[PDB]
Amino acid sequence: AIDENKQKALAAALGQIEKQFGKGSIMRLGEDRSMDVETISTGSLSLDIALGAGGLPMGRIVEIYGPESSGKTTLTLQVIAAAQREGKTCAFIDAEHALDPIYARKLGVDIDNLLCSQPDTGEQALEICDALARSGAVDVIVVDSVAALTPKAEIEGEIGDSHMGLAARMMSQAMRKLAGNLKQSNTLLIFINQIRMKIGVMFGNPETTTGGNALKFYASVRLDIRRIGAVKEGENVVGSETRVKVVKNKIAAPFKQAEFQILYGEGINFYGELVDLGVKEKLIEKAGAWYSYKGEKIGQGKANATAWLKDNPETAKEIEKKVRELLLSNPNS
Amino acid sequence: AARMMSQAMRKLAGNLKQSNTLLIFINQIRMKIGVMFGNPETTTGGNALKFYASVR
Amino acid sequence: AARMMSQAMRKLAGNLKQSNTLLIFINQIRMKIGVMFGNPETTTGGNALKFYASVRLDIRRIGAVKEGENVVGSETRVKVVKNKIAAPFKQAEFQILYGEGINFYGELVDLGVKEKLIEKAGAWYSYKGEKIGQGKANATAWLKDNPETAKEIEKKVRELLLSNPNS
DNA sequence: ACTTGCTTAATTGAATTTTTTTTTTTAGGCTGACTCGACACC
DNA sequence: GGTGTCGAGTCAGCCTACCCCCCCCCATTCAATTAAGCAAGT
DNA sequence: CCCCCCCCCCCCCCAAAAAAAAAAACC
Ligand SMILES: Nc1ncnc2c1ncn2[C@@H]1O[C@H](COP(=O)(O)OP(=O)(O)OP(O)(O)=S)[C@@H](O)[C@H]1O
Ligand SMILES: [Mg+2]
């Protein structure tokens, strides 16, 4: 008796809300396809595993932070390169004024279709982000350094002048405005941030990021990237040994980490990863310092084993297919 | 209230002068809103009393 | 809302006086922003109630009351910010204990010490030589057990500090 | 009977520095900028 | 025929009317220091 | 005895509401 009266009052209210605000304003969460999480590759297989859902989520905000020369720009360009290869449009907002277009081409970016902007102010940078988000025509936006998003008042002003929390306020306002626009357009926004030291602290770590506290809350993923060593061809340093910690994750379990090589002028070493994962999943046998695939000695030393996998495009397909099958915990589709 | 004050001033001003009686009105401040230029402080009971007052 | 409150006061002030009825309005605090003349703490509902009020009390929590670790109440301060029936700007300090209310015996200690009926050496409370406890809580706990001395100290404090007693 | 360490509570001090600017809800005038027709002159 | 220039018309943004009330502001936590009373040693 | 004719003028305001936000090593 009361059941029917409640179901009718509910049905009437739902009808009135959908009339006043629009069609999909309120609905049951189980029958809402908009809310399903879709992901894209990072151009690193170990990082796609660490993220738990096979890559970075569309319609969300991501933060990548780290020290100087850690690989923050190189990593965001490999994301763009991968996205372009699946026929997606990408934008680069270069607030640092430090992008080399020749190096971007060497990492596999289609330069001639990559939208670029070198804005004057933080406001202009973030108004271009909102304009491209509302359009529905851009799939990935990268904002290179939050640290270089200078408010207009600070550019007009003198060096030494105080602007209390003015960048932090700008970023707080930006997040509020963007979150909704990005979810509707299914657009991925990636923010790069720099590290700074906070003083008057003895608990926790003294490392901070720039641009205040809003971005920590709204980010669905946060990556801490670091250079942990060198890659040498005898004497010549030819690349960096890199580590990425997943510091925040809302689309899968956090605190996982990824290890890989960045080689100068190539990018992330995909086959270098595919060796290490093939080893861990018992598909490649490392008998001391001798890498072996089904008895056949593919080489000795990681570089020779990688060079062998490069020469055999069938054996690389085989191992990738198995590793993808096994380790990807939440496959999206 | 503005009308009642308007009518009272008309009636009282002449009766006070004849009898030589001092009449003191106390008023409270309110805040007039939708004013940018100047002082947003008003008093109560309309405009008549400003005109008929010999001292404010 | 400011208009409604302005209209309400006009109507109520006279009706309350005839009936001899006490009306108490509780108000919340809000922040005034921009170009501020004075303190940025405001109250809600416009400017009428400030004029019509015969008494205005500002109440504040100034600390915790702890039984070792367990927080068992609040230390409170009340400022008299407006008064038309006696002189203003006097203040009161008392304890609110959760589930009991205002700690009457705690006030009686503090008023006993002020009017020399109780002797306080460091943190040692003495009534006519006899030592009644160390610390305000043990002193209070004694006065709770000895209602003869409580009634005596109350009667003397009322005689001293309350100017005109009851009818 | 004289002196000292322990007890329990309450009191006071430091905690590196030092800093900003904005709205909706005006009304009516003044400045500068853009549009268009066309008339003088090479 | 085309470009500079005279002229009327229309539109977007700024600013100036304006005096200027305050009576002085919302407040905390850990730990070193002080001290009156009382049991233990002499 | 016999039979109507015609309008005139406004008056007064009332009330506030609300925060937002870090930035940086030094030997
Ligand atoms: N144009 C280039 N040619 C060769 N190597 C490069 C080039 N640009 C960057 N690298 C190297 O790639 C590695 C990572 O560089 P990035 O990806 O630019 O790092 P990053 O964190 O953006 O550092 P910033 O912005 O300069 S603090 C470093 O060892 C660089 O020296
Ligand atoms: Mg960079």
XYZ file of C-alpha atoms (C1' of nucleotides) and ligand atoms in Angstrom:
699
model
C 0.000 0.000 0.000
C 2.737 2.478 1.209
C 5.213 0.833 -1.317
C 3.076 2.067 -4.322
C 2.675 5.641 -2.831
C 6.534 5.901 -2.421
C 7.216 4.445 -5.974
C 4.704 6.998 -7.475
C 6.150 9.979 -5.459
C 9.648 8.845 -6.689
C 8.509 8.434 -10.364
C 6.784 11.909 -10.209
C 9.914 13.637 -8.686
C 12.250 11.936 -11.279
C 9.819 13.125 -14.035
C 9.871 16.733 -12.646
C 13.756 16.814 -12.316
C 14.220 15.449 -15.922
C 11.685 18.085 -17.211
C 13.417 21.030 -15.375
C 17.133 20.123 -16.084
C 17.117 17.702 -19.114
C 16.929 14.043 -20.168
C 19.827 12.237 -18.340
C 19.839 14.693 -15.330
C 19.066 11.822 -12.872
C 19.086 8.031 -13.551
C 20.037 4.661 -11.946
C 23.864 4.234 -11.890
C 23.670 0.641 -13.273
C 21.975 1.905 -16.517
C 24.337 4.959 -17.068
C 26.942 4.125 -19.806
C 28.546 7.671 -19.488
C 29.987 6.622 -16.046
C 31.969 3.608 -17.505
C 35.805 4.130 -17.325
C 37.604 4.028 -20.757
C 41.487 4.161 -20.833
C 44.364 4.906 -23.320
C 48.001 3.603 -23.388
C 50.889 5.561 -21.724
C 53.375 4.124 -24.323
C 54.850 2.071 -21.374
C 53.569 -1.514 -20.731
C 54.880 -1.651 -17.072
C 53.061 1.690 -16.289
C 49.770 0.440 -17.953
C 49.985 -2.578 -15.506
C 50.829 -0.309 -12.467
C 47.721 1.863 -13.234
C 45.570 -1.325 -12.926
C 42.979 -0.435 -15.674
C 45.426 -0.595 -18.678
C 46.182 3.186 -18.925
C 44.951 6.740 -18.128
C 41.176 7.389 -17.848
C 39.325 9.590 -20.425
C 37.133 12.459 -19.093
C 39.424 12.855 -16.028
C 42.320 15.011 -14.723
C 45.854 13.490 -14.329
C 48.896 15.071 -12.544
C 52.540 14.115 -13.382
C 55.161 15.641 -11.038
C 58.845 15.039 -10.326
C 62.327 16.610 -10.108
C 64.305 18.362 -12.897
C 65.075 16.103 -15.945
C 62.963 13.129 -14.650
C 61.122 12.581 -18.014
C 57.799 14.462 -17.439
C 57.603 16.029 -20.977
C 58.986 12.884 -22.746
C 56.306 10.770 -20.924
C 53.399 13.136 -21.909
C 54.631 13.167 -25.579
C 54.612 9.303 -25.710
C 50.931 9.461 -24.434
C 50.100 11.935 -27.312
C 52.059 9.808 -29.883
C 50.064 6.643 -28.852
C 46.713 8.562 -28.909
C 47.434 10.026 -32.432
C 48.166 6.438 -33.728
C 44.509 5.574 -32.672
C 43.188 8.624 -34.675
C 42.718 11.093 -31.736
C 43.291 14.913 -31.818
C 45.776 16.296 -29.195
C 46.736 19.771 -27.860
C 49.949 20.934 -26.046
C 49.681 24.123 -23.852
C 53.430 24.989 -23.415
C 53.418 27.516 -20.490
C 57.173 26.757 -19.799
C 58.049 27.941 -23.414
C 60.508 24.995 -23.773
C 59.095 22.472 -26.349
C 61.485 21.294 -29.166
C 59.359 20.241 -32.234
C 62.242 18.134 -33.757
C 62.543 16.008 -30.533
C 58.696 15.616 -30.429
C 58.862 14.214 -34.050
C 61.651 11.723 -33.021
C 59.387 10.346 -30.175
C 56.696 9.650 -32.865
C 54.379 12.713 -32.503
C 52.627 13.750 -35.770
C 53.799 17.433 -35.446
C 51.586 18.643 -38.371
C 48.315 17.699 -36.465
C 49.472 18.511 -32.833
C 47.693 21.767 -31.740
C 50.168 23.986 -29.794
C 49.810 27.203 -27.716
C 52.486 29.322 -25.886
C 50.175 31.490 -23.739
C 51.125 34.809 -22.017
C 49.177 34.258 -18.711
C 47.811 31.348 -16.615
C 44.232 32.649 -17.254
C 44.708 32.536 -21.090
C 46.246 28.994 -20.790
C 43.231 27.709 -18.729
C 40.585 29.551 -20.910
C 42.080 27.755 -24.019
C 41.803 24.415 -22.035
C 38.065 25.155 -21.293
C 37.414 26.258 -24.978
C 38.992 22.985 -26.371
C 37.164 20.877 -23.679
C 33.695 22.366 -24.592
C 34.374 21.917 -28.399
C 34.294 18.062 -28.098
C 36.943 17.912 -30.921
C 40.119 17.391 -28.746
C 40.772 13.995 -27.013
C 44.024 14.771 -25.006
C 45.265 18.171 -23.636
C 48.737 18.497 -21.958
C 49.432 21.664 -19.834
C 53.262 21.766 -19.451
C 54.027 23.050 -15.922
C 51.397 24.399 -13.537
C 54.503 26.229 -12.099
C 54.633 28.556 -15.178
C 50.824 29.355 -15.057
C 51.438 33.005 -13.995
C 48.309 35.064 -13.048
C 47.791 38.325 -15.079
C 48.237 40.525 -11.916
C 51.738 38.972 -11.325
C 52.864 39.669 -14.973
C 51.598 43.320 -14.871
C 53.174 43.666 -11.355
C 56.863 44.087 -10.288
C 59.319 41.358 -9.097
C 59.162 41.293 -5.237
C 55.379 42.138 -5.136
C 53.235 39.708 -3.018
C 50.113 38.004 -4.543
C 48.695 35.972 -1.584
C 47.404 32.572 -2.846
C 46.481 34.113 -6.238
C 47.787 31.132 -8.330
C 46.151 28.677 -5.811
C 42.800 30.560 -6.174
C 43.117 30.480 -10.030
C 43.730 26.665 -9.914
C 40.841 26.095 -7.399
C 38.531 28.083 -9.802
C 39.839 26.252 -12.936
C 39.135 22.736 -11.457
C 35.483 23.638 -10.539
C 34.910 24.907 -14.160
C 36.830 22.105 -16.005
C 35.843 18.820 -14.183
C 32.280 18.854 -15.667
C 33.251 20.011 -19.208
C 35.915 17.219 -19.469
C 33.524 14.415 -18.343
C 30.883 15.522 -20.958
C 33.444 15.738 -23.856
C 35.303 12.532 -22.717
C 38.584 14.608 -22.842
C 41.792 13.694 -20.873
C 43.580 16.733 -19.265
C 47.220 16.001 -18.110
C 48.866 18.613 -15.791
C 52.678 18.561 -15.370
C 53.890 19.999 -12.002
C 57.373 20.866 -10.603
C 58.587 20.055 -7.040
C 59.411 22.718 -4.379
C 60.600 22.435 -0.738
C 58.262 23.570 2.110
C 60.070 24.993 5.205
C 58.662 24.932 8.779
C 57.944 21.129 8.670
C 59.608 18.113 10.469
C 56.754 15.497 9.952
C 56.325 13.728 6.538
C 58.456 14.698 3.467
C 59.455 18.373 2.888
C 58.640 18.058 -0.910
C 55.550 19.934 -2.259
C 54.120 20.657 -5.731
C 53.190 24.168 -7.013
C 49.720 25.764 -7.573
C 48.001 24.905 -4.234
C 45.874 22.000 -2.971
C 42.865 21.839 -5.424
C 44.598 19.671 -8.090
C 45.347 16.863 -5.528
C 41.566 16.476 -4.890
C 40.261 16.594 -8.520
C 43.054 14.379 -10.015
C 41.912 10.741 -10.745
C 45.613 9.682 -11.177
C 48.838 11.227 -9.753
C 52.286 9.952 -10.947
C 55.647 10.641 -9.196
C 58.402 10.110 -11.876
C 62.180 9.944 -11.019
C 65.577 9.280 -12.683
C 67.188 6.389 -10.658
C 70.315 5.775 -12.864
C 72.090 5.893 -16.281
C 72.070 3.623 -19.405
C 75.630 3.322 -20.900
C 77.021 1.850 -24.185
C 80.407 1.320 -22.427
C 81.344 5.024 -21.810
C 78.660 7.049 -23.749
C 75.531 7.721 -21.562
C 72.729 6.859 -24.107
C 69.631 7.097 -21.794
C 67.999 7.179 -18.304
C 66.766 4.383 -15.961
C 63.308 5.695 -14.811
C 60.796 4.815 -11.989
C 57.073 5.876 -11.834
C 55.116 5.509 -8.524
C 51.288 5.677 -8.735
C 50.763 8.010 -5.710
C 46.940 8.401 -6.237
C 44.466 6.201 -8.199
C 40.593 6.273 -8.294
C 40.184 3.737 -11.192
C 42.207 0.855 -9.508
C 44.409 0.118 -6.403
C 47.287 2.612 -5.816
C 50.980 2.466 -4.641
C 52.127 0.181 -7.527
C 55.293 1.212 -9.460
C 56.864 0.776 -12.938
C 60.573 0.641 -14.021
C 61.715 1.359 -17.616
C 64.429 3.021 -19.772
C 64.136 6.376 -21.624
C 66.682 6.323 -24.539
C 67.697 9.805 -25.865
C 66.058 10.457 -29.291
C 63.951 7.196 -29.279
C 61.776 7.530 -26.103
C 60.561 4.673 -23.815
C 62.238 1.283 -24.612
C 59.123 -0.920 -25.306
C 61.155 -4.142 -25.995
C 63.321 -3.560 -22.857
C 60.040 -3.768 -20.817
C 58.755 -6.817 -22.826
C 61.966 -8.772 -21.878
C 61.618 -7.968 -18.100
C 57.844 -8.911 -18.135
C 58.452 -12.092 -20.254
C 61.079 -13.082 -17.565
C 58.700 -12.369 -14.594
C 55.857 -14.449 -16.268
C 58.244 -17.464 -16.964
C 57.990 -17.016 -20.824
C 61.753 -16.033 -21.052
C 64.404 -18.018 -19.019
C 67.374 -15.944 -17.637
C 69.986 -18.685 -16.817
C 72.391 -16.361 -14.873
C 73.024 -13.635 -17.533
C 71.789 -15.746 -20.564
C 68.228 -14.904 -21.839
C 66.533 -17.980 -23.499
C 63.094 -18.355 -25.278
C 61.887 -22.055 -25.308
C 65.539 -23.350 -25.189
C 66.748 -21.043 -28.070
C 69.333 -18.580 -26.551
C 67.930 -15.142 -27.687
C 71.167 -13.510 -26.325
C 73.384 -12.660 -23.271
C 72.994 -9.223 -21.590
C 69.639 -7.301 -21.618
C 70.702 -5.076 -24.633
C 71.516 -8.126 -26.907
C 68.190 -9.822 -25.851
C 66.337 -6.514 -26.703
C 68.236 -6.316 -30.082
C 67.168 -9.977 -30.805
C 63.437 -9.155 -30.059
C 63.742 -6.119 -32.457
C 65.021 -8.468 -35.277
C 62.082 -10.964 -34.661
C 58.709 -9.087 -34.985
C 56.752 -12.458 -34.688
C 58.371 -13.508 -31.320
C 57.638 -9.967 -29.882
C 53.895 -10.255 -30.933
C 53.756 -13.748 -29.246
C 55.174 -12.546 -25.838
C 53.176 -9.204 -25.841
C 49.886 -11.150 -26.482
C 50.565 -13.486 -23.453
C 51.804 -10.688 -21.043
C 48.686 -8.572 -21.972
C 46.408 -11.676 -21.403
C 47.940 -12.476 -17.937
C 48.894 -9.253 -16.074
C 46.249 -6.581 -17.077
C 44.043 -6.865 -13.898
C 40.999 -4.727 -15.057
C 40.810 -4.875 -18.930
C 38.499 -2.018 -20.195
C 36.279 -2.434 -23.355
C 4.523 54.631 7.949
C 6.040 57.272 5.564
C 2.448 58.574 4.919
C 1.566 58.641 8.669
C 4.815 60.625 9.347
C 4.089 62.998 6.371
C 0.559 63.753 7.775
C 1.786 64.122 11.424
C 4.406 66.825 10.432
C 1.737 68.972 8.612
C -0.563 68.784 11.710
C 2.156 69.209 14.435
C 4.442 72.019 13.083
C 1.896 74.857 13.680
C 0.518 73.487 17.015
C 4.142 73.271 18.367
C 5.026 76.896 17.336
C 1.849 78.363 18.988
C 2.432 76.473 22.318
C 6.285 76.961 22.152
C 6.761 73.134 22.606
C 10.051 71.350 21.657
C 9.365 67.923 20.001
C 12.413 65.521 19.865
C 12.216 62.425 17.571
C 14.737 59.584 18.087
C 15.414 57.483 14.927
C 17.356 54.251 14.213
C 19.711 53.686 11.236
C 18.929 51.143 8.495
C 20.981 50.226 5.392
C 19.710 51.147 1.881
C 20.766 48.442 -0.648
C 21.348 48.732 -4.421
C 23.365 51.977 -3.812
C 27.107 52.004 -4.827
C 27.771 55.810 -4.794
C 27.962 57.332 -1.287
C 26.641 56.528 2.240
C 24.285 53.480 2.394
C 22.948 54.607 5.853
C 19.279 55.747 5.976
C 16.950 56.559 8.886
C 13.378 55.150 9.284
C 9.891 56.650 8.576
C 10.379 58.299 5.131
C 11.471 61.770 3.970
C 9.051 64.270 5.691
C 11.021 64.509 9.006
C 14.301 65.613 7.264
C 12.353 68.628 5.864
C 10.429 69.719 9.030
C 13.377 69.254 11.483
C 15.057 72.561 12.590
C 18.037 70.536 13.990
C 19.326 67.015 13.069
C 14.686 38.483 5.721
C 15.950 41.873 7.085
C 12.481 43.382 6.216
C 10.571 40.459 7.887
C 12.721 40.943 11.053
C 12.248 44.789 10.985
C 8.412 44.242 10.702
C 8.387 41.471 13.406
C 10.149 43.702 16.036
C 7.693 46.677 15.552
C 4.738 44.214 16.065
C 6.268 42.163 18.970
C 7.961 44.766 21.290
C 4.596 46.116 22.614
C 2.763 42.717 22.824
C 5.685 41.246 24.908
C 5.683 44.215 27.397
C 1.879 43.988 28.077
C 2.019 40.170 28.588
C 5.347 40.379 30.585
C 6.787 37.666 28.197
C 10.590 37.154 27.649
C 11.540 36.430 23.964
C 15.081 34.946 23.410
C 16.524 34.992 19.841
C 19.520 32.721 19.151
C 21.685 33.998 16.217
C 24.566 32.469 14.154
C 27.730 34.391 13.103
C 28.680 35.149 9.465
C 31.677 36.974 7.922
C 31.385 40.508 6.364
C 33.701 40.757 3.240
C 35.226 43.584 1.110
C 35.783 47.168 2.483
C 34.992 46.683 6.242
C 34.139 49.417 8.797
C 34.747 47.515 12.118
C 35.068 43.751 12.928
C 34.177 41.336 10.080
C 31.969 39.109 12.353
C 28.257 39.862 11.651
C 25.008 38.237 12.844
C 22.157 37.181 10.474
C 18.714 38.815 9.830
C 19.630 42.550 9.406
C 19.968 45.489 11.850
C 16.536 45.755 13.641
C 17.239 43.136 16.409
C 20.385 45.040 17.663
C 18.195 48.115 18.463
C 15.170 46.275 19.989
C 17.250 43.817 22.148
C 17.513 44.864 25.854
C 20.433 42.385 26.346
C 22.905 40.887 23.801
C 25.216 37.971 24.872
C 28.291 36.813 22.865
C 29.030 33.151 23.950
C 32.332 31.341 23.085
C 34.063 27.990 23.770
C 37.575 28.930 25.091
C 38.862 25.360 25.856
C 38.219 21.705 26.886
C 37.418 20.089 30.294
C 39.301 16.707 30.516
C 39.005 13.765 32.987
C 42.666 12.887 32.193
C 42.141 11.939 28.483
C 38.283 11.814 28.061
C 36.966 15.308 27.009
C 33.917 15.590 29.376
C 32.882 19.269 28.766
C 33.636 22.824 27.471
C 35.155 25.902 29.201
C 32.779 28.766 28.164
C 32.958 32.627 28.181
C 29.881 34.964 27.964
C 30.426 38.714 27.233
C 27.506 41.143 27.807
C 27.866 43.266 24.597
C 24.582 45.238 25.130
C 22.668 45.992 28.378
C 19.796 48.518 28.978
C 18.864 47.305 32.542
C 22.423 47.670 34.071
C 26.051 48.497 32.980
C 27.476 46.465 30.031
C 30.847 44.857 29.010
C 30.975 42.503 32.042
C 31.820 38.811 31.368
C 31.153 35.347 32.884
C 33.347 32.189 32.743
C 31.841 28.741 33.487
C 31.994 25.036 32.453
C 29.327 23.184 30.382
C 29.581 19.421 31.221
C 28.091 17.110 28.516
C 24.783 15.591 29.773
C 24.606 17.718 33.029
C 24.747 21.342 31.699
C 26.262 24.333 33.588
C 28.534 23.233 36.526
C 26.971 25.289 39.418
C 29.552 24.111 42.067
C 32.496 25.078 39.764
C 31.115 28.693 39.703
C 30.656 28.639 43.533
C 34.381 27.728 44.071
C 35.533 30.618 41.758
C 33.110 33.168 43.412
C 34.118 31.872 46.918
C 37.842 32.526 46.015
C 37.024 36.059 44.637
C 35.099 37.084 47.858
C 37.750 35.516 50.236
C 35.243 32.916 51.685
C 37.629 30.235 50.188
C 41.502 30.402 50.430
C 43.504 29.295 47.302
C 47.272 28.652 47.909
C 48.826 27.682 44.499
C 46.352 24.852 43.608
C 45.190 23.992 47.217
C 41.622 25.041 48.289
C 40.995 25.657 52.067
C 37.605 26.533 53.744
C 38.171 27.820 57.365
C 41.597 26.037 57.642
C 40.133 22.614 56.532
C 41.693 21.605 53.122
C 38.899 20.488 50.690
C 41.074 19.304 47.703
C 43.966 19.896 45.235
C 42.683 21.360 41.900
C 39.235 22.814 40.991
C 37.702 19.323 40.218
C 38.498 17.830 43.715
C 37.296 21.145 45.328
C 34.004 20.900 43.295
C 33.727 17.150 44.243
C 33.987 18.096 47.997
C 31.272 20.877 47.742
C 28.998 18.243 46.012
C 29.405 15.956 49.138
C 28.993 18.814 51.762
C 25.686 20.603 50.817
C 25.660 22.428 54.261
C 28.812 24.509 53.318
C 27.546 24.891 49.664
C 24.259 26.525 50.931
C 26.316 28.756 53.363
C 28.831 30.012 50.679
C 25.946 30.493 48.113
C 23.896 32.593 50.641
C 26.960 34.838 51.477
C 27.999 35.271 47.752
C 24.356 36.296 46.878
C 24.313 38.803 49.859
C 27.700 40.333 48.716
C 27.551 40.453 44.863
C 23.790 40.471 43.880
C 23.058 44.209 44.596
C 19.232 44.170 45.254
C 18.086 40.667 46.446
C 14.644 39.044 45.660
C 11.210 40.556 46.690
C 61.054 17.465 65.700
C 63.885 19.254 61.202
C 64.894 18.576 56.159
C 64.205 16.720 51.280
C 62.225 14.285 47.050
C 57.832 13.086 45.093
C 53.035 14.271 43.779
C 49.612 16.567 41.258
C 47.948 20.474 39.450
C 47.992 24.991 37.260
C 50.615 28.686 34.720
C 53.057 30.691 30.928
C 55.998 30.670 26.695
C 57.008 29.750 21.925
C 55.467 28.118 17.471
C 62.159 31.213 11.982
C 58.525 35.282 7.887
C 55.056 38.327 5.916
C 51.904 39.566 2.387
C 45.966 40.909 -1.361
C 41.903 42.312 -3.713
C 37.378 41.497 -5.669
C 30.423 41.772 -6.946
C 25.607 42.123 -8.083
C 21.946 45.654 -8.056
C 22.927 51.294 -11.201
C 22.052 56.108 -14.736
C 23.506 58.915 -18.076
C 27.124 60.920 -20.239
C 31.960 60.900 -22.851
C 35.700 58.741 -25.522
C 37.314 55.956 -29.001
C 36.561 52.519 -32.693
C 34.333 50.561 -36.681
C 31.091 50.909 -40.919
C 29.714 52.763 -45.106
C 28.787 56.369 -49.000
C 31.038 59.031 -51.850
C 33.793 62.955 -53.510
C 38.693 64.830 -54.798
C 42.613 63.666 -57.479
C 46.397 60.850 -59.687
C 39.725 52.674 -61.406
C 41.476 53.022 -57.106
C 43.163 55.048 -52.653
C 43.112 58.917 -49.426
C 40.043 61.334 -46.932
C 35.489 64.071 -45.289
C 31.500 63.122 -43.084
C 27.433 61.026 -40.526
C 26.004 57.308 -37.915
C 26.161 53.534 -34.526
C 28.074 50.675 -30.694
C 31.196 48.919 -26.476
C 33.412 50.231 -22.269
C 34.691 53.545 -18.696
C 33.548 56.628 -15.338
C 31.414 59.740 -12.399
C 28.015 60.720 -9.720
C 28.959 59.862 -4.185
C 30.430 60.576 0.633
C 32.404 57.780 3.576
C 29.536 54.717 8.981
C 34.989 51.815 11.892
C 35.869 52.903 17.127
C 38.965 48.336 16.311
C 38.616 42.941 15.414
C 37.302 36.397 14.923
C 42.302 32.795 18.589
C 45.509 27.299 19.908
C 48.542 23.288 21.515
C 52.456 20.936 23.403
C 55.855 21.205 26.932
C 59.119 23.669 30.319
C 58.525 25.962 34.764
C 56.591 26.829 39.776
C 54.810 25.524 43.918
C 51.967 24.012 48.276
C 51.292 19.682 50.525
C 52.845 15.247 52.306
C 55.590 10.752 53.108
C 60.411 9.162 53.989
C 64.815 9.799 56.061
C 67.237 11.692 59.795
C -48.610 74.735 -11.381
C -44.360 73.594 -13.804
C -39.826 71.293 -14.100
C -33.437 69.746 -12.816
C -28.524 70.438 -13.246
C -23.776 68.943 -12.667
C -17.948 66.485 -10.575
C -13.643 66.937 -8.148
C -8.853 65.375 -6.774
C -3.784 61.586 -5.176
C -0.510 59.438 -1.902
C 3.748 57.393 0.338
C 9.312 53.457 0.235
C 11.890 49.385 2.291
C 15.698 46.586 3.499
C 21.808 43.207 3.356
C 24.598 39.489 2.089
C 28.755 36.681 1.981
C 35.094 34.315 1.703
C 38.941 32.880 -0.782
C 43.626 31.014 -0.932
C 50.150 29.490 -0.120
C 54.767 30.309 -0.817
C 59.720 29.029 -0.210
C 65.725 26.960 1.747
C 69.862 27.865 4.325
C 74.934 26.540 5.414
N 65.817 17.401 -27.661
C 66.414 16.392 -26.967
N 67.359 15.570 -27.519
C 67.931 14.585 -26.775
N 67.588 14.332 -25.471
C 66.646 15.082 -24.836
C 65.998 16.167 -25.569
N 65.108 16.733 -24.734
C 65.179 16.069 -23.554
N 66.096 15.098 -23.628
C 66.473 14.181 -22.557
O 65.386 13.361 -22.150
C 65.483 13.203 -20.732
C 64.167 13.656 -20.111
O 63.909 15.003 -20.496
P 62.476 15.647 -20.314
O 61.465 14.637 -20.785
O 62.525 17.004 -20.964
O 62.352 15.817 -18.714
P 61.479 16.927 -17.962
O 61.109 16.361 -16.642
O 60.493 17.621 -18.889
O 62.602 17.964 -17.535
P 62.470 19.568 -17.549
O 61.089 20.083 -18.051
O 63.557 20.112 -18.348
S 62.544 20.021 -15.581
C 66.667 14.033 -20.223
O 67.836 13.250 -19.992
C 66.886 15.009 -21.345
O 68.205 15.557 -21.419
Mg 59.666 19.541 -19.590
